[PDB]
Write a protein that binds this ligand. Sequence first.
Ligand SMILES: *[C@@H]1O[C@H](CO)[C@@H](O[C@@H]2O[C@H](CO)[C@@H](O)[C@H](O)[C@H]2NC(C)=O)[C@H](O)[C@H]1NC(C)=O
Ligand SMILES: [Ca+2]
Lengths: 130, 130
Amino acid sequence: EFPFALEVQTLPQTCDGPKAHTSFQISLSVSYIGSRPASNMAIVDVKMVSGFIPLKPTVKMLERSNVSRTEVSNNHVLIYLDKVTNETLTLTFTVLQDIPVRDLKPAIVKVYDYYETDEFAVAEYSAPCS
Amino acid sequence: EFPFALEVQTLPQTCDGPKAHTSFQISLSVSYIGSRPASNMAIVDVKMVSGFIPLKPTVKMLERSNVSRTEVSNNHVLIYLDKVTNETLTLTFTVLQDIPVRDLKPAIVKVYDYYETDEFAVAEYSAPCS
Ligand SMILES: *[C@@H]1O[C@H](CO)[C@@H](O[C@@H]2O[C@H](CO)[C@@H](O)[C@H](O)[C@H]2NC(C)=O)[C@H](O)[C@H]1NC(C)=O
Ligand SMILES: [Ca+2]
């Protein structure tokens, strides 16, 4: 059982051209559906597809939201959500191909409450030209 | 006084804390109150407060209603309505502070008929912490 609804899409969704190989946006949607009225502070952890890096200003721009901190470390983007309720929060940022890698595999995204254990969900996404 | 009724408010309405400095919602309401039964195609044109930009997905979200399309362009948000009648349409979207600018002055919102140059309204709004 997952007390968060988590889904991830890319923009573009398909390998629709040369540009889709070297850059795409990641678009995450999250809400809280568990036993409590709402989450506490929560973290969304996005792992990068192999060879991809996040574009810093589009990560920092998420802080303008209902997000109070972000971090880029070790090929992960961390997003600190203030509070998650039954309303869907959508977050979008850009990634860039730093190193082309063959055989691109899916990357996992996790969301978890910062303070209560076993309040988490997982999902995955792929580069559009995988 | 205009053949359109046009009102604009921001969420939050005042500078209620740190987050009000860096993002807010723009909420506008419009109806046609003129001689004619309804307006033709009308355009709503929202100019950004200095330093702010729209959160594009919340603009694109408007596109389902009397709303035939939206555009983000040269730091205006443009909303195309197929027709406007006496019933009030409310449209709400998010803007984000990209760069902090000193001394924020009010920004203009317009609605006008695609054909009748005499049929327009104007209203002002300010960033909550301007
Ligand atoms: C971040 O969360 C806030 C909640 O505080 C959202 O603000 C609400 O937005 C809706 C929809 O436009 C309004 O109907 C509510 O009145 C707002 N409430 C407040 C307290 O402002 C906001 O939409 C969220 N920002 C996102 C989703 O990016
Ligand atoms: Ca649990």
